[PDB]
């Protein structure tokens with residue numbers, strides 16, 4: 001168990017002692033347990049717990065997660081609290097300017113290869129449909145997708161890299177005429193109906209918990225977490241983005257720190273499986289429709305999500321160029337951008353668009 | 354219906370159109386209805402509605418309340434959202450840097466004279482007991498009461514007024530040796546057990562809605578609102594503060610814009626009525642205790658709340674001196690401070706403390 005810095009141990013102790021009820025309120029510092037889950041300069045994570053020799057007095061948690069950040073803060077905090085109330089996220093035990101105390105959920109993250117297991121995929125779809133029914137106190141105009149793409153496009157155009165390979169790679173990505181391609185994509189998506197729903201916007205394996213002790217259970221073995229990029233957006237984006245994430249493995253241990261495989265995109269059969277779980281979770285009398293009406297709804301959704309998958313590639317390709325300029329994480333951002341653009345044109349070839 | 358300024362109408366229209374679903378998303382500006390509920394430079398309130406000629410498409414509200422403000426913002430927003438989720442406050446429809454959109458609750462505020470009606474008092478007690486059971490993600494150390502009193506005491510000591518009557522009045526209030534009196538109060542309250550609960554801290558008639566159409570109902574005719582000063586604090590403060598508010602009427606239409614009457618404090622009989630509704634709402638098997646045990650719990654609570662009532666006087670007396678220095682509202686702050694201190698020493702005489 002990696003121990004935090006002394007300053008961090010002391011602050012964590014104080015936050016626990018003051019924001020948690022019951023035994024925590026009287027806990028001795030020399031009996032406080034803390035270990036690092038994720039280090040870094042931002043969004044550091046720690047597990048904090050009572051000693052085994054201290055009894056619970058009421059319903060207080062014995063262990064919590066501390067997130068340190070290291071207005072978007074109001075929106076994210078409100079969102080987190082609401083999801084907690086609704087039993088769709090970890091409980092919220094404490095909020096303070098430096099961070100928050102969250103329910104500790106014994107789990108691991110999914111690996112990329114697990115996203116295609118039929119029971120896993122079906123549950124993700126159900127979870128996403130549930131998330132998409134959330135009414136949330138946020139702007140409902142679906143400006144997020146193309147607003148963010150336009151923002152990132154204008155930033156990318158102005159980047160001045162100093163390192164040769166990044167200069168070269170950028171020149172290649174910008175050679176596609178990104179302003180025109182963005183508007184070609186806008187025109188396509190303007191003629192692709194997709195309801196506006198509350199989207200996660202990052203439904204990748206690293207944001208999906210496999211709950212400890214539920215690994216052999218039929219259903220209800222996952223939790224979708226890490227909602228910080230959620231917004232009202234087109235349903236098609238969230239689903240298409242998920243499908244895209246089948247192609248990328250971020251656990252690759254050498255440069256560029258990911259692996260990409262175009263052949264791992266879900267087949268239409270796999271997509272139909274996902275869609276067939278999504279739809280009755282999103283409209284519960286769906287099951288009562290005729291076979292033919294279910295069939296047209298599913299076919300329309302296949303086209304919808306595969307078209308919107310293009311926007312996942314375009315948006316996250318542009319994002320990754322911006323990260324190559326601004327990030328402080330070691331990751332092959334330029335190579336990832338090229339993988340996304342390569343997949344964008346591959347999918348465009350496949351769609352006939 | 355007082356109309357807002359054109360800029361405000363336009364912003365309100367945009368906030369409604371973008372944060373509310375259904376018919377609002379397509380509403381014409383020339384059919385948007387808005388009127389001012391409360392003006393001012395801070396915390397302005399407006400009612401906003403669909404025209405009667407526009408149909409609801411789903412479950413969207415036809416009318417909302419707009420609050421404009423004109424980190425405490427994170428905490429207050431999180432608190433509001435959580436209370437809304439739990440059905441203890443108005444629903445939260447939109448949050449943005451300038452304000453929020455809230456559920457519109459047809460109602461009026463209570464008048465001071467209504468606080469003593471036995472059914473009203475019993476319901477307030479039930480509502481307060483319910484609020485006091487809230488688990489909330491805020492600091493649980495009860496530093497709020499004396500921390501705030503110390504802050505305000507140090508500020509009051511340093512005030513330099515320029516206007517003669519305020520100079521004179523301040524000299525009189527400070528002549529009591531407020532540092533020593535604060536510590537006398539601390540010593541008394543240190544020997545008065547009172548559980549730490551989530552307190553409203555401002556349970557006055559102006560924060561209690563009488564729900565339209567429930568005015569002749571037995572129960573469930575009120576809503577406690579305006580939670581912005583809530584904090585974990587001693588239960589005794591919230592109850593004692595409420596009792597204090599029986600003495601003050603803030604609707605008096607001439608200077609000093611309140612009336613005070615020491616004889617309107619609840620009698621012990623009235624207090625027992627309030628307590629007898631509070632306790633089974635706060636500990637639901639209370640009713641199953643013996644008569645003698647119920648009797649000792651009630652007697653202990655009478656002493657607890659009447660002692661803590663002293664802290665309502667002291668704290669809000671100090672607050673009102675600070676407002677005489679910093680406020681921009683026309684209100685007889687110095688006279689109100691003197692009324693609170695007069696009541697502090699009256700209650701101390703009555704208690705024998």
Ligand SMILES: CN(C)c1cc[n+](Cc2ccc(OCCOc3ccc(C[n+]4ccc(N(C)C)cc4)cc3)cc2)cc1
Pocket residue numbers: 201202204206229250251252253254257316319329330331336
């Ligand atoms: C903003 N948003 C909602 C997005 C943005 C981007 N994407 C696509 C995307 C998703 C995950 C993603 O990276 C996931 C994290 O992967 C990491 C990989 C490596 C590292 C660092 N690293 C370097 C070296 C190393 N070794 C020593 C082996 C281990 C880890 C950190 C994170 C990158 C792009 C989706 C949504």
Ligand SMILES: CN(C)c1cc[n+](Cc2ccc(OCCOc3ccc(C[n+]4ccc(N(C)C)cc4)cc3)cc2)cc1
Pocket residue numbers: 554555557559582603604605606607610669672682683684689
């Ligand atoms: C911070 N906190 C939780 C507190 C602070 C103080 N107190 C005690 C207190 C409560 C209410 C209170 O004032 C309530 C509002 O009363 C007003 C009265 C008059 C006005 C302004 N005014 C002036 C002139 C006028 N006429 C033209 C007749 C009408 C209104 C505004 C508000 C003053 C002290 C409790 C809790």
